[PDB]
């Protein structure tokens, strides 16, 4: 199929980085030579100098293309061919040079598919965190939004988060669980509706928050260099999500390469403050997990390597173990290795207030988010009436716009199946269009809307 607009745009950018004249330059200020010519966007020293921890995907792709001047990209695959009949019976009855997996060497991935996670409004994050503040129990959510150019790294991409949807879940003081099938079925419906709003499911976010007992609002720092950043189970979760949300690329043999799906953790920083850390996992991680080669066990920082079975062939596995200077040495990754090596890190932030606001939803709060009944925040007629009824008859379109421009409000209204599909589209336009007044005028006049407001009137 086609690539995202952001990938098409960045393919058409050259990412050149002009340089000052060098000492060694034997020419004028406007001349050029090997010492002062523009750097390519993937230039390692530039990234090191500027403390950019990974090069961007398009810097990486342009680097591969230059060095190969065959699809430059290919998703790694560590699975044994269980149907090789090249002069033997297939695994586990036989093996040959064509089907036998060779030794795997793991290392920190030098590029990242997404460079930055931008939350459109701090209220989005703060209302998610409120689930934990209110209950003392952890929380999981899916992030909706889109991808755009990020100019603070060469050819960078940012995930732009517009909303968070929390799936049904069983939260506890020190973790949480989900019914995988239940969540999948629900997210299928939410994905479809979010798509009608111009949103994609672009990542996941979860808390690891524990009050530090100082009456400060301060929290413990659990995740740091001497413990772990993401646990092996979390890395496996992230890999599975990435593989299920593949990034389309015409430059890969398979038509896809890795994923733009991002993983965020809200937890204490070293100063005891609530902060966000953002990650993806490497394509090596994707392939390890697809081949069912790693598991979580005793120590959360370590990825445990699984055994060879009838279904799974596990070759020798090495990793490029780093010292404090960043110098690596090849070591045996078995029986377990630090899962750190499977991560890439992303920056995160919020738009500045005077940046041109292109936020999809005017309000992030005010109407209960989904799956918060146990928090005392139900989505009912009583709640919708309280939220919306008086404004809906005031003639105040500014306030009405503010009320309906709200992701969780929209999903709840659509679930009532009062509005027609045309009226539903009208309501979406009223919520997310820059010029929304004409749409809202149509909606308010529609039979479906009138029906809804009347239903609100009679309830209570
Ligand atoms: Zn020069
Ligand atoms: Zn074979």
Numbering used by the authors: 113 to 181, 190 to 580
What does the report in the manuscript say about this coordinate set?
Polyubiquitylated proteins in isolation can be direct targets of the proteasome, whereas those embedded into membranes or assembled into multisubunit complexes need to be extracted or segregated by the conserved AAA-family ATPase Cdc48 (yeast) or p97/VCP (metazoan) with the aid of its cofactor complex, Ufd1–Npl4 (UN), prior to the proteasomal degradation. The UN heterodimer is one of the best-characterized cofactors. Here, we present the crystal structures of yeast Npl4 (zf-Npl4-MPN-CTD) in complex with Lys48-linked diubiquitin (K48-Ub2) and with Ufd1 at 2.55 and 1.58 Å resolutions, respectively. The crystal structures reveal that the distal and proximal Ub (Ubdist and Ubprox, respectively) moieties of K48-Ub2 interact with the C-terminal helix and N-terminal loop (N loop) of Npl4 CTD, respectively, and that Ufd1 binds to the groove of Npl4 corresponding to the catalytic groove of JAMM.
The region containing residues 113–580 of Saccharomyces cerevisiae Npl4 (yNpl4113–580, with the prefix “y” indicating Saccharomyces cerevisiae proteins) specifically recognizes K48 chains in vitro. The triple E123A K124A E125A mutation was introduced to reduce excess surface conformational entropy. The yNpl4113–580 (E123A K124A E125A) protein yielded high-quality crystals, and its structure was determined at 1.72 Å resolution by the single-wavelength anomalous diffraction (SAD) method using the zinc edge. The yNpl4113–580 structure consists of three subdomains, zf-Npl4, MPN, and CTD, similarly to the previously reported structures of Npl4. The yNpl4 MPN subdomain consists of the MPN core and two insertions, Ins-1 (residues 287–317) and Ins-2 (residues 403–462), similarly to other MPN DUBs.
